[PDB]
């Protein structure tokens, strides 16, 4: 049986997927940020295919290459918006589009996007406690 797992999502240079400012409002974007204990870097990978933080779901704002990612209300989002799959090698795919979560820098406020998979170092996401 698949069980939920809470984890940090660790990307390029060991920075963590982070909701900017720690706010849990709908449509707040995600970025990379130095890893810390804050709740906005704690993600739960669920069996249902959602990835959640602070009670909200990671979603792209659109389904095209270059769409930025954000959090939004889960129950309201359609499966296409909210379903992801994390592969063992680190690819984090947006299931409906086949695009993958991609970082856009390690400096502040570098908003993550979904892009065509190029097996770039910006497209590998590790789990950590
Ligand atoms: O600026 C940016 C930043 C990030 O987002 C982090 O994570 C946070 N923290 C908490 C605690 O939330 C801040 O605020 O912001």
Short mmCIF file of N, CA and C in Angstrom, two decimals, residues 18-126:
data_model
loop_
_atom_site.label_atom_id
_atom_site.label_comp_id
_atom_site.label_asym_id
_atom_site.label_seq_id
_atom_site.Cartn_x
_atom_site.Cartn_y
_atom_site.Cartn_z
N UNK A 18 10.43 25.82 -1.99
CA UNK A 18 10.01 26.74 -0.95
C UNK A 18 8.88 27.64 -1.45
N UNK A 19 7.81 27.79 -0.69
CA UNK A 19 6.74 28.74 -1.06
C UNK A 19 7.19 30.13 -0.60
N UNK A 20 7.26 31.06 -1.55
CA UNK A 20 7.84 32.35 -1.26
C UNK A 20 7.16 33.08 -0.10
N UNK A 21 7.99 33.42 0.91
CA UNK A 21 7.50 34.19 2.04
C UNK A 21 6.80 33.35 3.10
N UNK A 22 6.64 32.05 2.83
CA UNK A 22 5.96 31.18 3.77
C UNK A 22 4.46 31.32 3.80
N UNK A 23 3.89 32.10 2.86
CA UNK A 23 2.47 32.35 2.89
C UNK A 23 1.72 31.19 2.27
N UNK A 24 0.54 30.86 2.82
CA UNK A 24 -0.22 29.72 2.32
C UNK A 24 -1.41 30.12 1.47
N UNK A 25 -1.47 31.40 1.03
CA UNK A 25 -2.54 31.87 0.20
C UNK A 25 -2.52 31.16 -1.14
N UNK A 26 -3.68 31.08 -1.78
CA UNK A 26 -3.72 30.50 -3.10
C UNK A 26 -2.89 31.35 -4.06
N UNK A 27 -2.18 30.66 -4.97
CA UNK A 27 -1.43 31.26 -6.06
C UNK A 27 -0.11 31.93 -5.65
N UNK A 28 0.40 31.62 -4.48
CA UNK A 28 1.76 32.01 -4.13
C UNK A 28 2.78 31.10 -4.79
N UNK A 29 3.75 31.68 -5.57
CA UNK A 29 4.69 30.83 -6.31
C UNK A 29 5.69 30.08 -5.43
N UNK A 30 6.30 29.06 -6.02
CA UNK A 30 7.40 28.33 -5.41
C UNK A 30 8.74 28.76 -6.03
N UNK A 31 9.80 28.57 -5.24
CA UNK A 31 11.15 28.97 -5.57
C UNK A 31 12.12 27.95 -4.96
N UNK A 32 13.42 28.10 -5.22
CA UNK A 32 14.44 27.46 -4.40
C UNK A 32 14.88 28.41 -3.29
N UNK A 33 15.23 27.82 -2.13
CA UNK A 33 15.65 28.59 -1.00
C UNK A 33 16.53 27.71 -0.13
N UNK A 34 17.53 28.30 0.57
CA UNK A 34 18.32 27.48 1.50
C UNK A 34 17.41 26.71 2.43
N UNK A 35 17.81 25.45 2.66
CA UNK A 35 16.97 24.56 3.42
C UNK A 35 16.94 25.00 4.87
N UNK A 36 15.76 24.90 5.45
CA UNK A 36 15.54 25.19 6.85
C UNK A 36 14.34 24.42 7.40
N UNK A 37 13.99 24.60 8.68
CA UNK A 37 12.85 23.89 9.29
C UNK A 37 11.45 24.44 9.07
N UNK A 38 11.33 25.53 8.31
CA UNK A 38 10.06 26.19 8.10
C UNK A 38 9.07 25.28 7.35
N UNK A 39 7.80 25.49 7.69
CA UNK A 39 6.73 24.64 7.22
C UNK A 39 6.55 24.73 5.71
N UNK A 40 6.98 25.84 5.10
CA UNK A 40 6.82 26.06 3.67
C UNK A 40 7.90 25.38 2.83
N UNK A 41 8.73 24.55 3.46
CA UNK A 41 9.66 23.65 2.79
C UNK A 41 9.38 22.20 3.17
N UNK A 42 8.25 21.92 3.80
CA UNK A 42 7.85 20.56 4.16
C UNK A 42 6.73 20.14 3.21
N UNK A 43 6.97 19.11 2.40
CA UNK A 43 6.03 18.71 1.37
C UNK A 43 5.59 17.28 1.65
N UNK A 44 4.32 17.00 1.43
CA UNK A 44 3.85 15.63 1.59
C UNK A 44 3.53 15.09 0.20
N UNK A 45 4.21 14.02 -0.14
CA UNK A 45 3.91 13.30 -1.37
C UNK A 45 2.80 12.30 -1.07
N UNK A 46 1.62 12.49 -1.66
CA UNK A 46 0.52 11.57 -1.39
C UNK A 46 0.34 10.50 -2.48
N UNK A 47 -0.31 9.38 -2.09
CA UNK A 47 -0.64 8.27 -2.99
C UNK A 47 -1.50 8.70 -4.19
N UNK A 48 -2.34 9.73 -3.95
CA UNK A 48 -3.26 10.30 -4.92
C UNK A 48 -2.53 11.08 -6.02
N UNK A 49 -1.23 11.28 -5.86
CA UNK A 49 -0.46 12.01 -6.84
C UNK A 49 -0.28 13.49 -6.51
N UNK A 50 -0.90 13.99 -5.44
CA UNK A 50 -0.68 15.37 -5.05
C UNK A 50 0.60 15.53 -4.22
N UNK A 51 1.11 16.75 -4.26
CA UNK A 51 2.24 17.17 -3.46
C UNK A 51 1.81 18.39 -2.69
N UNK A 52 1.79 18.28 -1.36
CA UNK A 52 1.13 19.32 -0.58
C UNK A 52 2.03 19.95 0.46
N UNK A 53 1.80 21.22 0.73
CA UNK A 53 2.43 21.95 1.81
C UNK A 53 1.40 22.90 2.42
N UNK A 54 1.38 23.00 3.76
CA UNK A 54 0.54 23.97 4.42
C UNK A 54 -0.92 23.78 4.01
N UNK A 55 -1.30 22.54 3.74
CA UNK A 55 -2.67 22.21 3.37
C UNK A 55 -3.05 22.52 1.92
N UNK A 56 -2.10 23.02 1.11
CA UNK A 56 -2.36 23.43 -0.26
C UNK A 56 -1.54 22.51 -1.18
N UNK A 57 -1.89 22.53 -2.48
CA UNK A 57 -1.35 21.60 -3.47
C UNK A 57 -0.41 22.36 -4.40
N UNK A 58 0.72 21.75 -4.75
CA UNK A 58 1.60 22.25 -5.81
C UNK A 58 0.92 22.05 -7.16
N UNK A 59 0.86 23.13 -7.96
CA UNK A 59 0.27 23.08 -9.26
C UNK A 59 1.09 24.02 -10.15
N UNK A 60 1.12 23.77 -11.47
CA UNK A 60 1.58 24.76 -12.44
C UNK A 60 0.42 25.68 -12.75
N UNK A 61 0.76 26.92 -13.13
CA UNK A 61 -0.23 27.83 -13.61
C UNK A 61 -0.33 27.70 -15.11
N UNK A 62 -0.88 26.60 -15.55
CA UNK A 62 -0.94 26.32 -16.96
C UNK A 62 -0.27 24.99 -17.21
N UNK A 63 -0.26 24.58 -18.48
CA UNK A 63 0.30 23.27 -18.83
C UNK A 63 1.29 23.33 -19.98
N UNK A 64 1.86 24.51 -20.17
CA UNK A 64 2.83 24.72 -21.23
C UNK A 64 4.23 24.88 -20.71
N UNK A 65 5.25 24.57 -21.51
CA UNK A 65 6.63 24.83 -21.16
C UNK A 65 6.79 26.28 -20.72
N UNK A 66 7.44 26.44 -19.56
CA UNK A 66 7.67 27.72 -18.98
C UNK A 66 6.62 28.21 -18.00
N UNK A 67 5.52 27.45 -17.77
CA UNK A 67 4.52 27.79 -16.77
C UNK A 67 5.18 27.72 -15.38
N UNK A 68 4.95 28.75 -14.56
CA UNK A 68 5.49 28.72 -13.22
C UNK A 68 4.61 27.86 -12.30
N UNK A 69 5.18 27.40 -11.20
CA UNK A 69 4.46 26.61 -10.22
C UNK A 69 4.19 27.41 -8.94
N UNK A 70 3.18 26.94 -8.22
CA UNK A 70 2.57 27.70 -7.15
C UNK A 70 1.82 26.71 -6.25
N UNK A 71 1.28 27.25 -5.14
CA UNK A 71 0.31 26.43 -4.42
C UNK A 71 -1.11 26.91 -4.65
N UNK A 72 -2.05 25.96 -4.54
CA UNK A 72 -3.45 26.31 -4.71
C UNK A 72 -4.29 25.32 -3.92
N UNK A 73 -5.57 25.65 -3.76
CA UNK A 73 -6.53 24.80 -3.04
C UNK A 73 -6.69 23.49 -3.79
N UNK A 74 -6.50 22.40 -3.07
CA UNK A 74 -6.43 21.07 -3.65
C UNK A 74 -7.79 20.62 -4.13
N UNK A 75 -8.75 20.70 -3.22
CA UNK A 75 -10.02 20.06 -3.48
C UNK A 75 -10.63 20.72 -4.70
N UNK A 76 -10.40 22.03 -4.86
CA UNK A 76 -10.89 22.72 -6.04
C UNK A 76 -10.15 22.43 -7.36
N UNK A 77 -8.82 22.16 -7.32
CA UNK A 77 -8.01 21.90 -8.51
C UNK A 77 -8.44 20.61 -9.20
N UNK A 78 -8.35 20.58 -10.51
CA UNK A 78 -8.68 19.38 -11.28
C UNK A 78 -7.48 18.43 -11.23
N UNK A 79 -7.66 17.12 -11.43
CA UNK A 79 -6.56 16.15 -11.43
C UNK A 79 -5.42 16.61 -12.34
N UNK A 80 -5.75 17.17 -13.49
CA UNK A 80 -4.69 17.56 -14.41
C UNK A 80 -3.75 18.59 -13.76
N UNK A 81 -4.28 19.48 -12.94
CA UNK A 81 -3.47 20.53 -12.36
C UNK A 81 -2.55 19.96 -11.28
N UNK A 82 -3.02 18.99 -10.49
CA UNK A 82 -2.41 18.73 -9.21
C UNK A 82 -1.66 17.39 -9.14
N UNK A 83 -1.69 16.60 -10.21
CA UNK A 83 -1.07 15.27 -10.17
C UNK A 83 0.37 15.28 -10.70
N UNK A 84 1.25 14.82 -9.81
CA UNK A 84 2.67 14.72 -10.09
C UNK A 84 3.17 13.31 -9.85
N UNK A 85 4.33 13.01 -10.38
CA UNK A 85 4.97 11.77 -10.12
C UNK A 85 6.47 12.01 -9.96
N UNK A 86 7.01 11.57 -8.82
CA UNK A 86 8.41 11.69 -8.53
C UNK A 86 9.06 10.36 -8.88
N UNK A 87 10.02 10.39 -9.79
CA UNK A 87 10.73 9.18 -10.18
C UNK A 87 11.99 9.01 -9.36
N UNK A 88 12.47 7.75 -9.23
CA UNK A 88 13.61 7.49 -8.35
C UNK A 88 14.88 8.24 -8.72
N UNK A 89 15.05 8.55 -10.01
CA UNK A 89 16.25 9.22 -10.46
C UNK A 89 16.19 10.72 -10.22
N UNK A 90 15.04 11.20 -9.74
CA UNK A 90 14.90 12.62 -9.44
C UNK A 90 13.98 13.42 -10.33
N UNK A 91 13.50 12.85 -11.44
CA UNK A 91 12.58 13.58 -12.29
C UNK A 91 11.25 13.73 -11.58
N UNK A 92 10.73 14.95 -11.61
CA UNK A 92 9.46 15.23 -10.97
C UNK A 92 8.48 15.67 -12.05
N UNK A 93 7.65 14.74 -12.54
CA UNK A 93 6.87 14.99 -13.73
C UNK A 93 5.50 15.51 -13.35
N UNK A 94 5.02 16.47 -14.13
CA UNK A 94 3.65 16.91 -14.11
C UNK A 94 2.89 15.95 -15.03
N UNK A 95 2.06 15.10 -14.45
CA UNK A 95 1.59 13.92 -15.19
C UNK A 95 0.83 14.25 -16.49
N UNK A 96 -0.08 15.20 -16.45
CA UNK A 96 -0.92 15.47 -17.64
C UNK A 96 -0.09 15.98 -18.83
N UNK A 97 0.92 16.84 -18.57
CA UNK A 97 1.69 17.51 -19.61
C UNK A 97 2.94 16.72 -19.99
N UNK A 98 3.45 15.88 -19.07
CA UNK A 98 4.76 15.23 -19.16
C UNK A 98 5.94 16.18 -18.95
N UNK A 99 5.68 17.45 -18.67
CA UNK A 99 6.72 18.43 -18.41
C UNK A 99 7.22 18.15 -17.01
N UNK A 100 8.38 18.68 -16.65
CA UNK A 100 8.97 18.36 -15.36
C UNK A 100 9.34 19.64 -14.62
N UNK A 101 9.37 19.52 -13.30
CA UNK A 101 9.69 20.65 -12.41
C UNK A 101 11.16 20.99 -12.60
N UNK A 102 11.37 22.28 -12.84
CA UNK A 102 12.65 22.81 -13.27
C UNK A 102 12.96 24.06 -12.46
N UNK A 103 14.12 24.09 -11.84
CA UNK A 103 14.58 25.32 -11.18
C UNK A 103 15.15 26.28 -12.24
N UNK A 104 15.25 27.57 -11.87
CA UNK A 104 15.57 28.71 -12.74
C UNK A 104 16.62 29.60 -12.06
N UNK A 105 17.41 28.96 -11.22
CA UNK A 105 18.43 29.70 -10.52
C UNK A 105 18.41 29.36 -9.04
N UNK A 106 19.54 29.68 -8.40
CA UNK A 106 19.69 29.47 -6.97
C UNK A 106 19.66 30.79 -6.21
N UNK A 107 19.63 31.91 -6.92
CA UNK A 107 19.53 33.19 -6.24
C UNK A 107 18.10 33.43 -5.76
N UNK A 108 17.89 34.50 -5.00
CA UNK A 108 16.57 34.73 -4.42
C UNK A 108 15.49 34.91 -5.49
N UNK A 109 14.35 34.30 -5.18
CA UNK A 109 13.11 34.53 -5.85
C UNK A 109 13.20 33.95 -7.26
N UNK A 110 13.98 32.86 -7.40
CA UNK A 110 14.02 32.15 -8.67
C UNK A 110 12.86 31.14 -8.71
N UNK A 111 11.81 31.54 -9.40
CA UNK A 111 10.55 30.82 -9.41
C UNK A 111 10.73 29.58 -10.28
N UNK A 112 10.26 28.44 -9.77
CA UNK A 112 10.35 27.19 -10.49
C UNK A 112 9.24 27.09 -11.53
N UNK A 113 9.50 26.31 -12.56
CA UNK A 113 8.61 26.18 -13.69
C UNK A 113 8.48 24.72 -14.08
N UNK A 114 7.56 24.41 -14.98
CA UNK A 114 7.57 23.13 -15.68
C UNK A 114 8.12 23.34 -17.09
N UNK A 115 9.00 22.44 -17.49
CA UNK A 115 9.68 22.56 -18.78
C UNK A 115 9.80 21.19 -19.42
N UNK A 116 10.19 21.25 -20.71
CA UNK A 116 10.54 20.02 -21.38
C UNK A 116 11.72 19.38 -20.67
N UNK A 117 11.65 18.08 -20.48
CA UNK A 117 12.71 17.34 -19.86
C UNK A 117 13.98 17.30 -20.72
N UNK A 118 15.08 17.80 -20.16
CA UNK A 118 16.41 17.74 -20.80
C UNK A 118 17.42 17.01 -19.92
N UNK A 119 16.93 16.34 -18.86
CA UNK A 119 17.77 15.72 -17.87
C UNK A 119 18.82 16.73 -17.41
N UNK A 120 18.41 18.00 -17.23
CA UNK A 120 19.27 19.05 -16.70
C UNK A 120 19.47 18.90 -15.19
N UNK A 121 20.57 19.45 -14.63
CA UNK A 121 20.75 19.43 -13.18
C UNK A 121 19.70 20.25 -12.42
N UNK A 122 18.95 21.09 -13.14
CA UNK A 122 17.84 21.88 -12.63
C UNK A 122 16.57 21.03 -12.52
N UNK A 123 16.60 19.78 -13.00
CA UNK A 123 15.41 18.95 -13.11
C UNK A 123 15.47 17.68 -12.30
N UNK A 124 16.34 17.65 -11.31
CA UNK A 124 16.52 16.48 -10.45
C UNK A 124 16.16 16.88 -9.04
N UNK A 125 15.22 16.16 -8.41
CA UNK A 125 14.67 16.49 -7.11
C UNK A 125 14.77 15.30 -6.18
N UNK A 126 15.46 15.53 -5.09
CA UNK A 126 15.75 14.49 -4.10
C UNK A 126 14.88 14.67 -2.86
#
